[PDB]
Amino acid sequence: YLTFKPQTFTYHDPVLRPGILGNFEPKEPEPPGVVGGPGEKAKPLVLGPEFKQAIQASIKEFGFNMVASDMISLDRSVNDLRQEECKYWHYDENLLTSSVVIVFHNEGWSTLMRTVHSVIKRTPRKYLAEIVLIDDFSNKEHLKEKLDEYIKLWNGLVKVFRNERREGLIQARSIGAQKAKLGQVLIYLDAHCEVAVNWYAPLVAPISKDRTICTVPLIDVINGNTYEIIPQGGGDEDGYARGAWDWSMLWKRVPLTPQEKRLRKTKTEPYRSPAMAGGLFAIEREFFFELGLYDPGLQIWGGENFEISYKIWQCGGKLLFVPCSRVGHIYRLEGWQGNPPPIYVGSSPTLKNYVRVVEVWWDEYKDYFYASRPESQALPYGDISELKKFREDHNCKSFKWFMEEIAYDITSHYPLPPKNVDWGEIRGFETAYCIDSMGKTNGGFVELGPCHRMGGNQLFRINEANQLMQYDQCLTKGADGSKVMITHCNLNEFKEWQYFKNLHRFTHIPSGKCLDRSEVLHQVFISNCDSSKTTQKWEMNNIHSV
Amino acid sequence: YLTFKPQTFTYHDPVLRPGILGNFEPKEPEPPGVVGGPGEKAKPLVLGPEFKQAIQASIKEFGFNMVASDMISLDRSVNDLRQEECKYWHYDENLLTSSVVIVFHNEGWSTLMRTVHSVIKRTPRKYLAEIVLIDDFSNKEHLKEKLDEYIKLWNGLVKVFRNERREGLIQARSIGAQKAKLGQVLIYLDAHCEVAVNWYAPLVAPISKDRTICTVPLIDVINGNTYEIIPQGGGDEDGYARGAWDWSMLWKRVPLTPQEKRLRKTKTEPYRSPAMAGGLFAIEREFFFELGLYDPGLQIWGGENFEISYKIWQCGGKLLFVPCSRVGHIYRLEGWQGNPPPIYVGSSPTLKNYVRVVEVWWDEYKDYFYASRPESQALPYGDISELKKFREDHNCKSFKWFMEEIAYDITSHYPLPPKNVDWGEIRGFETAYCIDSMGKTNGGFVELGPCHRMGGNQLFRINEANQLMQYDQCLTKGADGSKVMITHCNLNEFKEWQYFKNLHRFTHIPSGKCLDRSEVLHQVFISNCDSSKTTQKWEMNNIHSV
Ligand SMILES: [Mn+2]
Ligand SMILES: [Mn+2]
User: Fold this and answer.
1) Phi, psi of A428 (to 5 degrees)
2) Rounded-to-integer distance, Cα B352 and Cα B365, Å
3) Which one of B116, B251, B452, B457 has the fewest CB atoms closer than 10 angstroms to its CB?
4) Which of A53, A230, A520 comes nearest B231 by C-beta?
5) Looking at the partner chain, which of A81, A231, A442 has a beta carbon nearest the beta carbon of B442?
6) Which of A101, A124, A129 shows the shortest CA–CA distance to A193?
7) Dihedrals φ, ψ of A202, to 5°?
């Protein structure tokens, strides 16, 4: 019998007037930061080789090409990745104000401040209540004091709040929502973003008609080396994807569906997505709290993005991607360092997070997740009570309802997994050797190695469909060898293993051959079944992580 | 008319006496270094997770699990990987003495001292003239003074010489030859090796019959994490491989041939290899100087291994692998750092080294190397006069003889490559966008990126066989997409492109379709040929590295 607070704000959905510009379209072309290079207007900035050593050093420190970034104007003009039809929407002007919160940890100076500059440059002043920077316990000296003094440039409009300890990314956003009090909606941004022209009105309009709508710009790709901005490769013939997952809860994208397109009169208006990537979005501040906000249990990574997506949909709100609001996100390069925290197992902490989201929201579907990740069944996921009560109190709808009403396309791209027959290490019987992937993928060969009971590349599972899998991969027979190979798997591919626990036998089905090894050297292969050979006896043992 | 000095030593090949042990077989099993754990007798040493933070730290520093190595005795016993027949050879005792030289740079203390301990432990005292460690300009403090003082343990048998500048691996071995004066034969050893039992007599017997024979132990794999010792995966039913290369001059191994076995009375006696891996070998010391020794133009990491192999074979010597002489070599783990020198620009010096070797030794076969690596064609490879005069003065045989008489099996595993039609960047006509691999391999999809004219992943070559190649990979059509994929390539696979330079066109032969691009999307695909579309117009420009 708990409900969200009713719409009191009146607002009119925008109107498309083909051939007429405005009202939030800039009248004239955007002034460059520097006439007329470099990095403008998002032209690629190619450097080196006189720079290559400085570039690599900065990549190690930041994951981005900071000597390139450092010569691009903080106020640089950008390419326009939106469709033409976007320019002919007329919007109320009666929009709710916003606090954009930006969480950063050790972010480079020029990438942090260009995010800030971009938002100041391309957002109507009257709607920008504040830009709140949440320092999640950085140690780099340029972010302290230097930042304090510089920030005075905006007469208090930009404020920073330090964290005493490293709260990690999810809880730092929740801290953000508490420390950002001036605006009516919270707009979250990564600290390495550039916001496109007339990004605000499209993004905040739907929230203005209906406070329980949560909004997501289309997230474009800023090349972390050369800084030109590219849309993502998404399904739609127009580039529109909706956010999705597979049944290990890995983020996936699928194309905009014809069903959703029949719901929409226009090509460019908002559209329903089952989930959001996580870093960039807008909610009405009160609604976030009614939500609220992110489950406190969630540790440093990773979403969180699904938890908030499910709450919104299943507790009566909406999640909309807004084609006419676009934001570029810089994507990391290899070479970063760039390092996890020391925890045990920790669980891992992020795995523990998936279990929290699944156990409170997925109902019967937890089965598909424990099939994809049995190693996670017996994990100490922590206290879930208040989250379960919240869902009952607000009479939230079932994950079945959610899968069939708003996420109906997912299972056509990521089909439901078969139940497991058994999972764990594949150990040679009465020995200390384990089949182990070496992390090989997509055609490599699987080896023998000393058992370490740590799961990971020594963890397998076997399907009711006769699939021997690690992660999203399967093992099959690599012709012409007798070698066992790991490749990408599809629902009816490589259904070729059957395991006889009592027999200590894995037997390849198309041949008659058994699973075999040589203990020196560390070799795994199939050969003609022979009950004498102890090299064809295996046990499959659950590896529990505490 | 120049000749190598004649054999003056009289020595007789050993004799195989099935059922009778000795004479260099240890009489009684090897005393462990520590009764009875850990590391003995090369049992794998599995640690953590209480150690995992300290292990990862040491892998970063050294590339080996040094916490594990540090708890294994320097005098540990080891598993015996040689075949049984090996223990029944009877050797004359009339063998040459040896200086073993170990070149090291920043090696971990316990891996370095276990190499030495191992050599001291399993080598008959009377043949071991000295162990010369060559410090190639290390900075780590354990390696100096602590090293000088420890080394007194052996009363001057072991000695270290410091280099004033980092000479690199190849030139450090040459300094070794010069500072290691006592032994009749030089035995080179990596600073992370463990020599097997009775490694010495099998390895030095052939050189004692014949001073122009250069000898190579079978190099076994010491696991850098758990330290158990495994033989290499190698062709022969017995695990015997011979050393080879592809026509880019990458090291390769091929199974021992039936031709070589008809030449051999025994399963276990030495056999011919066309090349050595490079780190571990034995030559008579004068003979190496007569070869004189490693071309001095080779910079740090290069095909020295190939250069000494061709010299030995084409100038009248022999290179033999010795099944009864085995040495374990620790193989690096990911996570090391582990870093190249700053000298720009190029592949660079190492590619320059390939060119020196090829230009002096491969004769007409240089064409195959340049088809594999056209980017090297116009490289300033340096003065090669004296090397060419050496080959002429000593009347060395042709590379054509070598390929047809002693390396007769290579083209059956790595076929001669077709000539190139063209090579270079694949640039969009009158654009600054280039096809580029992103380093993707074996199934990945090639993309468009900003041209940088630095080669590498933006470099391609097209075959006279209609193959579009980067490295060892080829581009083909990824069903069901219209995307262009990169995969592993075989002589008659994916013969499916034709490049018209004047037409600026790349056309896919099976379909009719033209290579096409988006630019805005950074996308490379094939679509139906349309002459109006400039997105289907491409140039292939040589990229020159100076
Ligand atoms: Mn991010
Ligand atoms: Mn090495």
Assistant:
1) -65, 135
2) 17
3) B251
4) A520
5) A442
6) A101
7) -55, -45
